[PDB]
Amino acid sequence: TDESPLCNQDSCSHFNGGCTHQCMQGPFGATCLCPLGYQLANDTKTCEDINECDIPGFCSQHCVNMRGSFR
Numbered sequence: 340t341d342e343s344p345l346c347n348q349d350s351c352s353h354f355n356g357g358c359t360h361q362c363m364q365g366p367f368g369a370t371c372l373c374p375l376g377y378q379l380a381n382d383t384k385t386c387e388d389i390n391e392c393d394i395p396g397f398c399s400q401h402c403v404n405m406r407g408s409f410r
């Protein structure tokens with residue numbers, strides 16, 4: 340209750356605490372926090388595009404996937 344499985348990453352400054360995307364820190368250290376349309380990878384210091392229409396029925400008909408959005 341004073342710690343987490345992730346601990347003592349730097350604050351969101353030194354190469355964003357190692358994050359390659361949008362980022363902040365709680366008292367435990369920095370993480371990425373991906374914008375709308377993106378997800379956190381395993382590493383929690385990088386973000387990946389969601390394939391928003393690999394999900395069946397997200398688009399009623401023809402779909403294309405693009406970085407951070409869909410058409």
Ligand SMILES: *[C@@H]1O[C@H](CO)[C@@H](O)[C@H](O)[C@H]1NC(C)=O
Nearest residue numbers: 344378379380381382383387
């Ligand atoms: C990490 O990647 C695997 C696929 O290699 C995925 O199944 C898993 O959900 C990921 N970890 C987390 C915390 O979601």
Ligand SMILES: [Ca+2]
Nearest residue numbers: 389405407408
């Ligand atoms: Ca996308």
